[PDB]
Ligand binder design. Structure first.
Ligand SMILES: Nc1ncnc2c1ncn2[C@@H]1O[C@H](COP(=O)(O)OP(=O)(O)OP(=O)(O)O)[C@@H](O)[C@H]1O
Ligand SMILES: Nc1ncnc2c1ncn2[C@@H]1O[C@H](COP(=O)(O)OP(=O)(O)OP(=O)(O)O)[C@@H](O)[C@H]1O
Ligand SMILES: Nc1ncnc2c1ncn2[C@@H]1O[C@H](COP(=O)(O)OP(=O)(O)OP(=O)(O)O)[C@@H](O)[C@H]1O
Lengths: 388, 148, 50, 322, 321, 56, 55
């Protein structure tokens, strides 16, 4: 009756230690809680203490491989929470160990990116040790759980094995990211920390379109525009407020890029009167590195937008079945395991997946829009300069 | 613009009416969103008109400069001031482009914010609708109408 | 604050006064009537598909 | 823009600063110099998190030893009378705060239990020590974060004893006076030297025209900081024509000193612009000699009234004596 | 050889000093100034040693009373529920840390236990007092943050207001202000007296050529500190030949002043050797006006621009005027 | 072992001063009791800090 | 508080046992000698000399 971590099966006899403590499925689950609880307690006072700006804008190495890893790691953790709630539907016992370990892992992951972001702005890499002593701490225990699921021959049929096997790789991937930061900056137990300075474009106080120089999530969310929009509501926009554009988008820099493309396009092709074909090749070579990025985001955005209609089909199909009988149909080691063929059949799970897919789809579509616009606006600047 | 505004606003209110009818709980959930949405709408409008007006102003000199450079090309080159005029263009082109770039950023900020708000509505409408149909036996077609 | 005024009453009155009495109310009722049918056809579809 | 604000909050953009490394001591210092409500939240979170973290591992040890398993009298648990995580939370609270009820207590032959008890006590002692140190230094230093020194919004240039004098009024809003008050006045100007030197914010120190030529000032009733503009004084060429707002002629008055109660040296800088300087005006007398004591009408503290005075230039004033 | 290092380490050698006191009270100061990892190690060791030492003596007392011998007897033990040294260690932990579980409790059996309980509590109370005392002293050291002032790597001799003057640059990297700042300039030379005296390291005060004729300055932006080389200075006999590395000359600049936030005095000594004195150079202007706030370019803090200056002697230069 | 306000007065004396005799102790299955124990412990510690700070 | 006074307990500024009077740069000069034992500097040191006599 009381909320029990392992459960109340057979007079709470799931807490036995005999035949090895590591062989107990509850304990390996409990060991997973610990690294998350460690990081929450360790870094919570640290984020509460810290609570021009150019000097605090340097980006750590792997600034993109961390955010995309966190988001996919957040996604699999949402799936783990959803799967665990499916697993305890059969038994009357709460079985809190199915989702609470995973649930607060997602909470701890959010704090890790918040804590890392604070270190990214405030250039204090020496604090980027808690995450290191956490990531391996979050990896070691997870590997134990994975091996134990392999020890009981769970197999890929069970959804938990697939998520755990995927989630350990995600923890492994970003563990490499953390030590990569150590290798470049060389601040821990090293002799000469390599000097990294913020980009010279933002050093001047005359840059206010800080789109290149911002975290990846705010790159896809345009969070930096909130300050400008709020400022707009009081002080009318003048050219003083919109300080000049960064060096990556300046008309002169664009013309240099356009000019260098023409030299490449006219050197090898001697019979190039700089006609339509030569100009088109010049435009493609100069701005292809961004047009493809816009297309990649746009193609991914189109594919994700289709998951919404599929999600509706799954939701309404499950709802039309008046039986409304749900069960995982198996209990591998005293804990019921749900399969993938039924995980994507649940209405609530499908609705959550639809919400997550919608978030991703809209971000990618809007990200593709801006990339195309920036390339289009940049080409206009370069084309006008060449015509003049 | 008048026709598009009327259709767009009528489609919007039609959608909220259906979702509230499909799930009355959404009415409660409409109170927060319709609050924050106004803020997003109000701030964007003030940030748009200014930006739009600024964009139009910044187009006037650039194009005019082009006309001068062809009506007075001989004098321009005779004075040996081509380098200064090239720099004048680059400043003009940068001013116009950043005016346009910020307008697009303002457009995208509104679009993403409204997209998230609409995505939250989908979750709220879905959650309430499945709960109604599993327990209170809501019509399956009504669930489909709410989600669509 | 003065610049950020939409001037809705002035502009709406100009269009309303120029349009008159008949062609203004007709557009409002016609546009509303068209959209209430669109809600109805989806709603009727739900009942029929049910 | 001005390099010193009226409220004494100087603001100069220290752009392009070499990246001095950051240390954990800065974070520790930030904890010490935090506000009062924030300190309570930090320490309450620190105490609660410490108990919770150790309660979690106490639960692990009991679970790994079979203590959390159903009843069995043969085995002796690493911690007696530990059943659920609620008991584990209570046991950690008792150990760290040293309440020690004794219903749940440590037992022998469980070396991990002894080790964590040592670790928890050592951690608890260091956490408590930090809290006492933070609280102890908070009462000492945070009391000296109040600036009760008021200058005049607008200064004057008047005619006292025949010689022109630049005057401003400063008063004390705290009953305890500032001990050993030193006043420093500096004219800030982009004075390009005739030899060719150019400096953007050259500071020229200005004398005080005190009774001894020093910089000591007694602060009981507000007084006028009057400096006689002479040939030595750079204000020898001051004119109302160069008194407009867009003129590079700014005065900085700094009254350093130590408050008797605490002993911490205090500084309160103020900046006066040419537009903020009112030529040919006189400060209103303040101290009225009542029957028993002296009355100070602080309402008319920084109010300046006109007076018929010469309006020529102090450099041109030398001709009148000649 | 140098009088004071460029950073301010002041590399000087002391020798032939009489027997220092080396009392007991100084060793505590050594404990006060320990590093954070070392202080933690010292205190963890002290607490653990105290717990263990008393744990041994409680075990010995239980052994002496014949209480840990197996077999229940009517003789009440000195301390109850003690059956091993591990139990004895736990009881010592409970008494000293004042947890006091109560599973193992003192009894009125033997007065030796009562006397030794007093000793453990007093030692535990005094150890906490020492630990808390050291924490207070060490916490101030964290708030200290002393060395954060910057000086140019090389000083100049330039022409300000027409007159030659020695000049250096001072900068405050700290955001916080330094109240009651003071500049002290000194010439460290080997000068001989007309009576035969040969002072090894003579230090001559050098005026700062301030407006008020004082040593007070005000550092909010990097400033030029210059002394006008005139007839009242030991540099009046300078020459371009006095630029070799092994030339007998040295300039010391001292920036005293109490930090506003900390409220304690800090010192920043720097030295300029003859090879670090650059004739015919000027300091580039640094502060650039901006719409938002005045901007300071700290990259060019030490950068200089060459300017033709009289390559003569000040005695001949001033007289020729 | 709570039987009157006198016993309750003694329990608060034991916890705030951190004596903890153990005759009256906090049990489980009463989360409200646990929450106030945390609140009373925090309040007692902050009062001691004020007293120690004021003494300094 | 005793910990605070532990650092300030001892002072180690050394003065010469006896003084001298010998001309320096032609001018007659009284002279004493001063020194510091501890490595730590004494900041803002100030020397005040006084002639005490019955007049
Ligand atoms: N009676 C007073 N009590 C406290 N501060 C005062 C008083 N009178 C003046 N001051 C301070 O002196 C400065 C200006 O002095 P002055 O007497 O000219 O005031 P003011 O013209 O009313 O200024 P403000 O516009 O800042 O209110 C301000 O910093 C103001 O806060
Ligand atoms: N090396 C040193 N270490 C410590 N104190 C010293 C040292 N040299 C001098 N002093 C201090 O300066 C005083 C004068 O030193 P001096 O060279 O005259 O020694 P002294 O004649 O042997 O001294 P005394 O007989 O007073 O001890 C000494 O009395 C002592 O207090
Ligand atoms: N931008 C700066 N920010 C901080 N300190 C600086 C800066 N520039 C110089 N310094 C300091 O001034 C001294 C050297 O000044 P200088 O301008 O010659 O720099 P440098 O040639 O880059 O020196 P170094 O190689 O010693 O770092 C050093 O003490 C250095 O710390």
């Amino acid at each position: 009756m009381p909320l029990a971590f392992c459960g109340t099966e057979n007079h709470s006899a799931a807490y036995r230690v005999d035949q090895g403590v590591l062989n107990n499925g509850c304990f390996v689950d409990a060991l997973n809680v610990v690294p998350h609880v460690f990081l929450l307690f360790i870094t919570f006072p640290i984020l509460f203490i810290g609570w021009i700006h150019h000097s605090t804008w340097l980006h750590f190495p792997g600034h993109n491989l961390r955010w995309i890893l966190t988001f996919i790691l957040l996604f699999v953790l949402v799936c783990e929470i959803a799967e665990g709630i499916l697993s305890d539907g059969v038994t009357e016992s709460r079985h809190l160990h199915l989702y609470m370990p995973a649930g607060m892992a997602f909470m701890a992951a959010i704090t890790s990116v918040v804590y890392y972001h604070n270190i990214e702005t405030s250039n204090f890499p020496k604090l980027l040790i808690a995450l290191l002593i956490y990531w391996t701490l979050a990896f070691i225990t997870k590997t134990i759980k994975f091996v134990k699921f392999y020890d009981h021959a769970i197999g890929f049929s069970q959804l938990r094995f697939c998520l755990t096997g995927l989630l350990v790789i995600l923890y492994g991937m970003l563990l490499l990211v953390e030590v990569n930061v150590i290798r470049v900056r060389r601040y821990i137990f090293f002799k000469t920390p390599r000097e990294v300075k913020p980009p010279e474009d933002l050093q001047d106080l005359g840059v206010r379109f800080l789109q290149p120089f911002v975290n990846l999530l705010s790159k896809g969310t345009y969070w930096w525009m909130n300050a400008f929009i709020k400022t707009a509501h009081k002080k009318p926009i003048d050219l003083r407020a919109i300080a000049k554009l960064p060096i990556a988008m300046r008309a002169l820099t664009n013309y240099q890029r356009l000019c260098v493309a023409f030299d490449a396009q006219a050197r090898k092709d001697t019979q190039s009167p700089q006609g339509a074909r030569a100009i088109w090749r010049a435009l493609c070579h100069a701005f292809g590195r961004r047009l493809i990025l816009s297309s990649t985001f746009r193609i991914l955005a189109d594919l994700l937008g289709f998951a919404g209609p599929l999600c509706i089909f799954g939701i309404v199909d499950h709802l039309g079945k008046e039986n409304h009988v749900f069960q995982p149909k198996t209990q591998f080691l005293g804990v019921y395991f749900v399969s993938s063929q039924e995980f994507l059949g649940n209405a609530y799970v499908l609705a959550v997946l639809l919400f997550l897919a919608l978030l991703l789809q809209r971000t990618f579509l809007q990200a593709s829009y801006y990339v195309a616009i920036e390339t289009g606006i940049n080409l206009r600047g370069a084309i006008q300069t060449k015509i003049y | 613009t008048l026709e598009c505004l009327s259709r767009s606003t009528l489609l919007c209110v039609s959608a909220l009416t259906v979702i509230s009818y499909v799930t009355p709980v959404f009415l409660v959930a409409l109170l927060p969103l319709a609050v924050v949405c106004y803020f997003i709408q109000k701030y964007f409008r003030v940030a748009s008109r200014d930006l739009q007006q600024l964009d139009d102003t910044t187009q006037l000199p650039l194009v005019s400069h082009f006309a001068e450079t062809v009506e007075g090309l001989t004098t321009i080159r005779a004075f040996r001031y081509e380098a200064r005029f090239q720099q004048k263009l680059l400043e003009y082109t940068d001013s116009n482009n950043i005016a346009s770039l910020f307008l697009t950023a303002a457009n995208r900020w509104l679009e993403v914010c409204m997209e998230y708000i609409g995505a939250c509505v989908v979750l709220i409408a879905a959650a309430t609708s499945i709960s109604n149909s599993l327990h209170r036996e809501l019509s399956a077609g009504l669930v489909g109408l709410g989600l669509t | 604050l003065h610049q950020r005024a939409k001037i809705p009453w002035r502009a709406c009155t100009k269009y309303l006064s120029s349009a008159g009495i008949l062609l203004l109310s007709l557009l409002v009722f016609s546009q509303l009537l068209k959209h209430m049918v669109l809600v109805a056809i989806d709603y009727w579809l739900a009942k029929w598909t049910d | 823009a001005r390099f010193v604000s009226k409220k004494g909050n100087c603001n100069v953009a220290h752009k392009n600063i070499r990246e001095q490394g950051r240390f954990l001591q800065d974070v520790f210092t930030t904890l010490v110099d935090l506000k009062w409500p924030h300190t309570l939240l930090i320490f309450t979170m620190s105490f609660l998190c410490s108990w919770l973290l150790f309660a979690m591992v106490w639960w692990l040890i009991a679970f790994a030893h079979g203590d959390l398993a159903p009843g069995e009298g043969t085995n002796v648990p690493c911690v007696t009378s530990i059943h659920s995580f609620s008991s584990a939370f209570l046991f950690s609270i008792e150990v760290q705060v040293t309440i020690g009820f004794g219903g749940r207590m440590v037992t022998e032959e469980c070396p991990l239990a002894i080790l964590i008890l040592i670790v928890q006590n050592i951690v608890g002692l260091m956490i408590n020590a930090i809290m006492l140190g933070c609280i102890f230094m908070k009462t000492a230093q945070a009391h000296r974060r109040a600036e009760t020194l008021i200058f005049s919004k607008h200064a004057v240039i008047t005619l006292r004893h025949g010689r022109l004098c630049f005057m401003l009024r400063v008063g004390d809003l705290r009953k305890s006076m500032i001990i050993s008050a030193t006043i420093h006045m500096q004219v800030v100007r982009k004075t390009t030297s005739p030899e060719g030197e150019v400096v953007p914010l050259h500071q020229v120190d200005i004398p005080m025209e005190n009774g001894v030529g020093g910089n000591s000032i007694f602060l009981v009733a507000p007084l006028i900081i009057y400096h006689v503009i002479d040939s030595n004084s750079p204000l020898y060429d001051l004119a109302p024509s160069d008194l407009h707002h867009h003129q590079d002629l700014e005065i900085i008055v700094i009254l350093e000193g130590v408050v008797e109660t605490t002993g911490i040296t205090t500084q309160a800088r103020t900046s006066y612009l040419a537009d903020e300087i009112l030529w040919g005006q006189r400060f209103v007398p303040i101290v009225a000699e009542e029957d028993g004591r002296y009355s100070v009408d602080y309402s008319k503290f920084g109010n300046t009234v006109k007076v018929p005075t010469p309006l020529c230039t102090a450099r041109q004033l030398d001709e009148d004596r000649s």
